């Protein structure tokens, strides 16, 4: 398999760029037909259940895609089962001879290594998990148990399992001695960074996907251009302006990607506009990136506007420290922002205590409040202090 599940979810929701609906519909009927996985062609009906812009035409004629038939049938199913049942007969025939011989621990472990990849390519999920239990007892060195972690990670990316896959990811990477081995630490900067996008982390994910080595090519799982795209996602949250001009802008890893593919408009247009603190050029790059980056990606569109709210409050905080008192009409004619839309932008933050700002509507001016105060820091310790005392009192009375 390639990319695991991406093209299947590209047709879930698309706001603009209808031409991508045809390419995404032709890819899902290509790779699945070329690969050996029987059931993954059937799941196309269950994935789009209760969704807007469904690409499945059965009882719903509202499909806007050019190819409206994803539905499972028996024509492709019979063709895929003939190739799956023929190869499993040859694999079980050769491996059974090695089980009775029992010569060395390599042939016993390698027999289940080819199976762990085979049961994943024939569409067996729970059956492939049982193959790891037999290969675990046949493991030789620490590297043999690492291949078990790959099977858990590969099979866990289909349904995006953040519990068993994420927990067993750090268990294999630790074991007794962690070390600087490339089969663990490098995969820790990739597999663990994927789970941070589903749990809305943006902190620990910025310490791996952003600052790392120059390759991290996983082939079938992820590519180089895919991982480099998320570098600008988590890099705009934790990393301040000091690290944006070093590990993002001036980093040589992202300099070669800008001159190669200019259609991203994320690591370049958004970073230059944010570094210059110019809202005039910062606005048009928000809609272009949201449409062609956040929406198509599976780990982004799940956030989408949730991630957009974090980018807007970043530029409003930078300009807030650049002046004390400024007229509302002066800023409207400077950065090219409307007066009506200005009240709605600041209305989703100030009442939430995200940004401290004062606006006088009599003279039409905006002021600057104190960004950091001693009492504002102690208010956070009230919830953290009472949050701990709640567990000590509740769990203390439970065990008695």
């Amino acid at each position: 398999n390639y990319e695991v599940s991406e093209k299947a979810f590209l047709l879930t929701q698309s706001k603009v760029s209808i031409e991508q609906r045809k390419e995404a519909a032709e890819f899902v009927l290509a790779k699945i037909k070329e690969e050996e996985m029987a059931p993954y062609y059937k799941y196309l009906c269950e994935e789009y259940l209760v969704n807007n812009g469904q690409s499945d035409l059965e009882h719903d004629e509202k499909s806007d895609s050019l190819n409206e038939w994803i539905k499972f049938d028996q024509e492709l199913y019979n063709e895929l089962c003939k190739k799956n049942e023929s190869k499993i007969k040859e694999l079980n025939e050769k491996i059974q001879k090695l089980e009775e011989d029992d010569e060395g621990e390599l042939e016993q472990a390698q027999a289940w290594i080819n199976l762990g990849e085979y049961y994943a390519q024939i569409g067996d999920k729970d059956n492939a998990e049982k193959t790891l239990g037999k290969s675990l007892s046949k493991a030789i060195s620490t590297g043999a148990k690492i291949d078990v972690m790959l099977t858990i990670a590969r099979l866990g990316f289909f349904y995006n399992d953040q519990l068993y896959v994420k927990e067993k990811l750090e268990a294999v990477n630790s074991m007794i001695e962690k070390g600087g081995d490339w089969e663990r630490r490098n995969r820790y900067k990739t597999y663990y960074g994927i789970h941070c996008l589903a749990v809305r982390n943006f902190k620990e994910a910025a310490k791996l996907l952003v600052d790392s080595l120059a390759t991290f090519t996983s082939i079938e799982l992820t590519s180089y251009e895919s991982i480099a795209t998320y570098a600008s996602v988590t890099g705009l949250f934790t990393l301040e302006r000091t690290d944006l001009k070093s590990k993002v802008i001036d980093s040589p890893e992202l300099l070669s990607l800008i001159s190669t593919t200019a259609a991203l408009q994320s690591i370049s247009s958004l970073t230059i506009s944010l570094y210059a603190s110019d809202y005039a050029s910062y606005f048009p790059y928000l809609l272009e990136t949201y449409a062609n980056v956040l929406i198509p990606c599976k780990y982004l569109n799940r956030h989408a506007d949730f991630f957009v709210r974090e980018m807007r409050r970043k530029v409003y905080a930078q300009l807030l420290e650049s002046y004390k008192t400024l007229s509302l009409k002066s800023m409207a004619s400077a950065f090219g922002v409307s007066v009506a839309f200005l009240d709605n932008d600041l209305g989703k933050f100030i009442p939430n205590k995200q940004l401290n700002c004062v606006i006088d509507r009599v003279n039409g001016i905006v002021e600057t409040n104190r960004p950091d105060n001693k009492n504002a820091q102690y208010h956070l310790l009230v919830k953290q202090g009472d949050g701990l005392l709640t567990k000590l009192q509740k769990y203390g009375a439970a065990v008695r």
Binding site: F283, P284, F306, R309, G336, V337, S338, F341
Partner: peptide
């Protein structure tokens, strides 16, 4: 999910593109 995922957003969709209308006319 504090003050974010519960109320979602439900804004800044068609109003974001509408901002370019007043920018390319009054100017």
């Amino acid at each position: 999910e504090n003050w974010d995922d519960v109320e979602v957003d439900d804004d800044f969709t068609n109003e974001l593109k509408a901002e370019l209308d007043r920018y390319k006319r009054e100017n």
